Design an enzyme around this catalytic site. Structure first.
Site, PDB file in Angstrom:
ATOM      1  N   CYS A   8       0.697  -1.152   0.014  1.00 15.68           N
ATOM      2  CA  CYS A   8       0.001   0.030   0.043  1.00 15.68           C
ATOM      3  C   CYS A   8       0.879   1.375  -0.023  1.00 15.68           C
ATOM      4  O   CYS A   8       2.116   1.154   0.397  1.00 15.68           O
ATOM      5  CB  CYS A   8      -0.913  -0.083   1.345  1.00 15.68           C
ATOM      6  SG  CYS A   8      -2.092   1.183   1.529  1.00 15.68           S
ATOM      7  N   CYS A  80      -4.929  -1.389  -0.339  1.00 15.74           N
ATOM      8  CA  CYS A  80      -5.819  -0.070  -0.047  1.00 15.74           C
ATOM      9  C   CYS A  80      -6.339   0.448  -1.073  1.00 15.74           C
ATOM     10  O   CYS A  80      -6.595   1.811  -1.319  1.00 15.74           O
ATOM     11  CB  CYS A  80      -4.769   0.924   0.731  1.00 15.74           C
ATOM     12  SG  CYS A  80      -3.309   1.443  -0.072  1.00 15.74           S
TER      13      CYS A  80
END
EC number: 1.20.4.1
Length: 131
Positions: A8, A80
């Site tokens: 992420c 994410c």
């Protein structure tokens, strides 16, 4: 063997525990490198909880993902979203994954305990499908 990433953007939250568990569960089956984007260290209290499950996550800090080529890798989790301010070759590996994994950054002990269980299960599912 399949090389894995759990990357992420940033590292103070997300990009922790998932790679640590994949190292653990995937040992001798698959390789793991979670380089990072816009990254930092993992959360301090994560390392303590993660070492309570016998796992290092602190040691992630390496070159940024941009330094690598995704064509060398087999599997990449974006953790994410899809876009993630991340180069597109990284999502377009043989398996794209991404989850609403909660993160214990500055949260109570219940959230660390929860995230170990959550992450173990996501990572086991990822390994079970690839391996």
């Amino acid at each position: 063997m399949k090389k894995v990433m759990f990357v992420c953007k940033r590292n103070s939250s997300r990009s922790q525990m998932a790679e640590g568990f994949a190292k653990t569960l995937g040992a001798g089956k698959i390789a793991v490198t979670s380089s990072g984007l816009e990254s930092s260290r993992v959360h301090p209290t994560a390392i303590a909880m993660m070492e309570e499950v016998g796992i290092d996550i602190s040691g992630q800090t390496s070159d940024p993902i941009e330094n690598f080529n995704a064509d060398d890798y087999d599997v990449v989790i974006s953790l994410c979203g899809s876009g993630v301010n991340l180069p597109p070759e990284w999502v377009t590996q043989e398996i794209f994954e991404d989850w609403q994994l909660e993160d214990p950054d500055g949260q109570s002990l219940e959230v660390f305990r929860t995230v170990r269980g959550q992450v173990k299960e996501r990572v086991e599912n990822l390994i079970a499908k690839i391996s």
